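User: Earlier you gave me the apo prediction for this protein. Now I'd like the version with 6-O-phosphono-beta-D-glucopyranose bound, so I can compare the two side by side. Same sequence as before, with the ligand SMILES added.
Assistant: Got it. Here's the input I'm using:
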Amino acid sequence: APVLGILCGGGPAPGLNGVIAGATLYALRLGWKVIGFMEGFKYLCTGDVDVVKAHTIDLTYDIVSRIHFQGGTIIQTSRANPRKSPELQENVRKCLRALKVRYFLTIGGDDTASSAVSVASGMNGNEISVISCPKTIDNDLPLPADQSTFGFHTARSLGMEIIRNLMVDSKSAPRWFLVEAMGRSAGHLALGMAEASGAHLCLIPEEFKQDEIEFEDVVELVEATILKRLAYGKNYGVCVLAEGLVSKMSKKALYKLFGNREPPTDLLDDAELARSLSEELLKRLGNLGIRITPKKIGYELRCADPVAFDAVYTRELGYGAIDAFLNGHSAALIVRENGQVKPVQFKDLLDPATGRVRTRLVDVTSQSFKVARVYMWRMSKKDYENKDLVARVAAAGKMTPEAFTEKFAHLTDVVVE
Amino acid sequence: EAPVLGILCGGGPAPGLNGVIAGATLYALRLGWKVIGFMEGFKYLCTGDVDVVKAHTIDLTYDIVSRIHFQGGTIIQTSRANPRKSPELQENVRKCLRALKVRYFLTIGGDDTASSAVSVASGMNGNEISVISCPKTIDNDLPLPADQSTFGFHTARSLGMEIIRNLMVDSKSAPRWFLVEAMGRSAGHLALGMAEASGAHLCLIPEEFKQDEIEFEDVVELVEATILKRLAYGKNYGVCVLAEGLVSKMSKKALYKLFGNREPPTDPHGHILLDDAELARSLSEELLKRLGNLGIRITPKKIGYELRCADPVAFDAVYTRELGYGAIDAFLNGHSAALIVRENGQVKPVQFKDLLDPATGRVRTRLVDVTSQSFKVARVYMWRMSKKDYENKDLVARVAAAGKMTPEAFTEKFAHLTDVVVE
Amino acid sequence: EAPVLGILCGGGPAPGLNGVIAGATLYALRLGWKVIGFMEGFKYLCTGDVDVVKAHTIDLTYDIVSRIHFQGGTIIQTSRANPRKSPELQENVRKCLRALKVRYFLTIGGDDTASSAVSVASGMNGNEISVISCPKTIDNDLPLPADQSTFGFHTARSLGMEIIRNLMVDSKSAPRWFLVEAMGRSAGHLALGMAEASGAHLCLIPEEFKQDEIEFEDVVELVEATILKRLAYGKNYGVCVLAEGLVSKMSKKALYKLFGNREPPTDPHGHILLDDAELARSLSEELLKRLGNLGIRITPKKIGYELRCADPVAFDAVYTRELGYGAIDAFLNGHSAALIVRENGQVKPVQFKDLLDPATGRVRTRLVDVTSQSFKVARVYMWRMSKKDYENKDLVARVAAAGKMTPEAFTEKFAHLTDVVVE
Amino acid sequence: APVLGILCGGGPAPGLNGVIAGATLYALRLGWKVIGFMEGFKYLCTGDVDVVKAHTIDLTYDIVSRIHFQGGTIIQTSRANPRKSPELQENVRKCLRALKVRYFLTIGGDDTASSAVSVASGISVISCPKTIDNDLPLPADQSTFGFHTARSLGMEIIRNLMVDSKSAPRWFLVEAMGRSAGHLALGMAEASGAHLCLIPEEFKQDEIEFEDVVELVEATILKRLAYGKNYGVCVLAEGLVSKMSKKALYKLFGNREPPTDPHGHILLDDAELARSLSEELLKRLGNLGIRITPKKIGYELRCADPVAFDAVYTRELGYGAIDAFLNGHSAALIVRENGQVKPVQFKDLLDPATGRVRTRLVDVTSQSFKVARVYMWRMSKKDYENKDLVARVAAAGKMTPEAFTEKFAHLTDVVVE
Ligand SMILES: Nc1ncnc2c1ncn2[C@@H]1O[C@H](COP(=O)(O)O)[C@@H](O)[C@H]1O
Ligand SMILES: Nc1ncnc2c1ncn2[C@@H]1O[C@H](COP(=O)(O)O)[C@@H](O)[C@H]1O
Ligand SMILES: Nc1ncnc2c1ncn2[C@@H]1O[C@H](COP(=O)(O)O)[C@@H](O)[C@H]1O
Ligand SMILES: Nc1ncnc2c1ncn2[C@@H]1O[C@H](COP(=O)(O)O)[C@@H](O)[C@H]1O
Ligand SMILES: O=P(O)(O)OC[C@H]1O[C@@H](O)[C@H](O)[C@@H](O)[C@@H]1O
Ligand SMILES: O=P(O)(O)OC[C@H]1O[C@@H](O)[C@H](O)[C@@H](O)[C@@H]1O
Ligand SMILES: [Cl-]
Ligand SMILES: [Mg+2]
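And here is the structure of the complex with 6-O-phosphono-beta-D-glucopyranose:
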């Protein structure tokens, strides 16, 4: 019987198990034998077939029949990337040939899909066929606008639930939370949690007009929101900050971010955007009775059990992977577009400037973004021109209307309106 | 003085109603509008008494609506009171809306509610009142672009998946079959959504039956063949999801059997009382007579009222926020007799007449498309006897033996089911 | 080689079973023991065929059990196969346990399961096998010190509260009364727990009735008085929780009305089939006849099977970890024919004789103590007509008016209920 | 009619609304008038009766009928502490007499109850035990309300981190909020089957050393590594920080002088215990294939909706508060023992040495703690004496058995065994 081998690469996203079971269950009805490599390419990279066999498992009906309820990956995952060396690619080729893998399904990001493509291009097209299923919780794939990636709905819904608790706590015991949403690729996740939870502010890198962000501008964008709320009698709130703001910050901004010290180097993961902003905002606003606390939302989302939307989603993706193999496809991506799962060649989706799959960011000109912005607390262009409002907000911050305008009015050219 | 926006809810609740109320109210308040909410839909506007209406309307203020986007239900309640059946009632609603000086009238409800709103408007000056309705249904039966859901549907489906998950674990731990009846007779979207998400072993919806009228025996035999096939692979347990809409497709003879070989009940005016039907219970009794001797136990379970007012999931919190906004946007843009709907990520008003089915005069009902790719995928992961399966003699012998019957007896009893449902 | 510990589950599942399996297994593995698990309780041990038993036993290894403390249900399944009724079966179980060289035998189940384990033990030498059972019940009906719960009860109560919350929001949003029937006829702990936690407007348990047999009319009237009193305060909706055990206290005449003025159903052996009763539905139909004219709609809802295999809450995860440990500790200390129970924060073995009720031969049933302060507190926050209320002429006039009847009629009809239930 | 005034003090806990609703509903059936002071003692401490009047609300039936489902507190809370000054204490009395409060119910932790009694020595005063830290001196085995909810949600969050730690091999250092005691950290850890839990109660000496904490985590990671597992979750009580010596705090803050408030007291809130330990352990263990990430669990627990156990608990506590008022009790705490709610005089609960409410910590000699410890991964005394085991672990850490013994064996005198 033909052998289908499955592995996962990259970080988990809710629904991985749904893709594994969707492919495996359908393949088993066709009489296929299904195996799963543990920890992605980690052990295939050694080329030692005994080591690979000690870290592969038989994906059977009993194993996969009920994993569609569970977050995580039953075959685990890794960022092992055989593409960096030609010897590693040939090790993976040597182990896949040894196992008689006819169909090769990888579930991972592009680094994972590219590894699959590298191993295949140096391999006869009649012995092995290779398909990758693109996974990302960041929702940054180039699908038709408003169409989500699998695992995103789960990550957003649980994030909404955590922020709900922080909104209740911020009101019950007046304080501001700066919630840093993990993920530096795009602003989909931070804005999704913020809009759903009715957070009072959301900052994403996509809304900044100039190419590089300055630390002072981020502090003042949050500062103006806190003062405006205070002008309406509210000394509390929640502001959600996409971690991707950090990767748009200038070199000088990163120097201030790390405590006016030299930034580490091989290192954006050591940055604490929400914490740094909290320290700065407390000096400026503490005298007004404001307390500010950072909170990170990230790792607890990756392996939450999938919500129904992602359970249906990943079942249809697993099916479509087997369907593509049957139709002779290879070097393709299983994606869902306009309700149809279909294979799409890797090159059809690449951005020529990057060599990586094209990244879809938040469209800050769309109506969805402007609607989210309407329900935020912030000072618009029109608001700065309203002298009754500007006087009340300035007074809340114990500064003159001229001082307030002098400091904050420029922010309308910092971010889209 | 400031224009008055009045809001009411009609029909049955769905998760996200409060989100539409908060989106409309908060945006309207930033425009300086005054916002009021009628309690229990058209119930008191139908009386024409302005004192009764005022005793059952409330001022929708910032503090009231600021944090209801987290909460299920309706803070202004709802009702099925329907003024469209009478011109005196329509004129009563007009008399009370004029009295309260409602400039913008937003109804959040089903088809009966939207039709009532337009009827009340056609006898009104287009410069004094403007009317917009927001379409609500957990049944997902609105004529929207395919695969795009109505608000509250995602919440109802996700909670339904979680409940069935408990029943799937319970069915395996203590071998048994559950016949889960999903509430809703309009369409099969909800039953099929929960089943596919939960990996249930079977789903039956009215849309998959070819003939115009379903027979009780056919439904019994579709479940029976599934139980036997699982039993042929050593599994004496499972979950089967049944859309309540199977009942409303059943023939006269099938309904007589459904109600216990009794005359089907009827209301004063002559409508058969399908709410009193107990589909899952009736089928369980029959399947237990046939299969209990094989070691099969079957139990019915209904999933319905606990879904309607669950707190909205994030998808519906965003959805209903954009709808509440879009209603205010439609008022500002001079629209009236329109329905706020979302299409390809864009909220826009769509005229009520544009959505009607010309043959019926009512809004067209979107059912499950059983020819689509999504339905064929759902069907692959179910346990069932397909056309090809009935031709596989090795399989038919294994299943027949599980049911303690000859292979010819099995083929004679169940094989006709391939002409009952689309394959 | 290493001592063999065999584990099986009997009876209906309860949240935390897996926690007991993992607590016992992990500790035993640190001791160097070999751990096996029989699938579906005594079902295959009853056959006596050792090949069949081996085909339905599994090696409980570290990797199998390391992360099952999060999961509801039981990974080794369960069954009600009861070898206690036959020694031919008991000796089959003995034959398979000797063949597998089970030194330590742990059963997690109800009274039938614990009794079966001891019967298999009384016919073996005390040196070759030691037997411990962990008593399981989601009904909280074990004779532990008062206010101390059985494992799985906290989870079932908390999930039941969550379901009723959705019904409380739905009952207010779309005015209606829900009759929530909590499944389980043993006791009233579960129904009262969900009701008190959720602030339900009424709860009826068999324990609060003074007389030995309940009458159908009295149950109807106790709910009816609550609906009328709420109606007198402008609320035409609510939730009432009914313990299913009301059915098992009903008189012969009461059961005749319950089943539709028919003879109660019966099994082949003549015993009555109370599972076919629909307590909430029958009361709903009757209450609709009496109160529908007042604007009341009433709907039944069952809460039962979705509770059994919910994932355990933290209280039950810690609880079942301590029980699994205490079973291994009891084996190590030479105990046998004992029950692992937790009392006053201490897990300890308790000999079978300490817990049996001599009248039954089965474990004693702990019911709700309706004289306790906890019950009086729960009763304070319900909507109901007390002794004092019937003597308050101002109140009786408003409630009577809500029911469109004279105060003389109301007192004459309902006043006797103060001798029906404890006050 | 008599006036019952209700306030909340301290940090929020799930079930606050349940006590407000139980007390208010029962009091209203008695014909009482019920008012709620906003933000605890914040405004009563000013002595300005005009300000207090602007921050009190009438607790009515429609307000409280359905808040037993809701986390947080509708009358908010604060840590305003009239106990620190006699001038403040008389301010609270002046405002309460002005409002003619006959019955005064405070709902709060140990800090709150001590404030309540100070106001009383000169109206009837009752306090209800609140704290997710479970650190009130209640009868043994009886929890404070809100503890069950905080622990159950904490278990659920850690479950997601456990699935993520195995799926994408890594160690999470979960910092559980609360420096008072170890109840919360040990509860979440035991329920979630976490691989290690460190609480201040298990340390023998009066002062913890930073190196000892690092090494307690290090030995657990190496032992797991000796059994083929390069991942896990370790739960750390924040109270480890408040036991650390002056030198341990210097290393904790980055070999900095610890921050301090204007009075000379150290600012432990600025400490990042889990983050600091992660940095140190990554330097030592990164080469072995170990990744370590810190995660804090705290503020998202405080205002979760109450679980059924806390809903019933706080319903009975609110009732018992009114019943104590009816029976003439004062300066008492409503507590539950053996299913009976009863008032317990405040003097019975004082620490003769401290004058403040006694703080109940984890009893590390109890059977519950010994069982929890059995299911952890750690090196006991007997384990350090097992030469076969010591060789296996030492090899996992790429060190000789002599090096391992010299570094780690002393830890048996650092923590109870
Ligand atoms: N930036 C903002 N975002 C959302 N709502 C706001 C904002 N500013 C004011 N509001 C609300 O808009 C309404 C109108 O404010 P005003 O024009 O000051 O009466 C009030 O209910 C405010 O709370
Ligand atoms: N109707 C069905 N739906 C889903 N899986 C099935 C169905 N029928 C058989 N299988 C599974 O498909 C695989 C192939 O079985 P076989 O037909 O014996 O080769 C086995 O794992 C079966 O349990
Ligand atoms: N049976 C009951 N259970 C709980 N609350 C009640 C009940 N009857 C009346 N109440 C409430 O108790 C308060 C006092 O009512 P009254 O005695 O009419 O002034 C009001 O808030 C009523 O709604
Ligand atoms: N510190 C520990 N805590 C819990 N389990 C352990 C610990 N150390 C070893 N184990 C497990 O206990 C069993 C006994 O291991 P061994 O003594 O090496 O045979 C194996 O399943 C180990 O994985
Ligand atoms: O055989 P089991 O253990 O009952 O598993 C049921 C499985 O049966 C199939 O219908 C589905 O494809 C699976 O998703 C489902 O879980
Ligand atoms: O060894 P794993 O796969 O990491 O499992 C983690 C286990 O580690 C142990 O500490 C516990 O006994 C288990 O309850 C826990 O789940
Ligand atoms: Cl075996
Ligand atoms: Mg404290």
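For your comparison, keep in mind: The CA atoms of residues 229 and 351 of chain C lie 50 Å apart.
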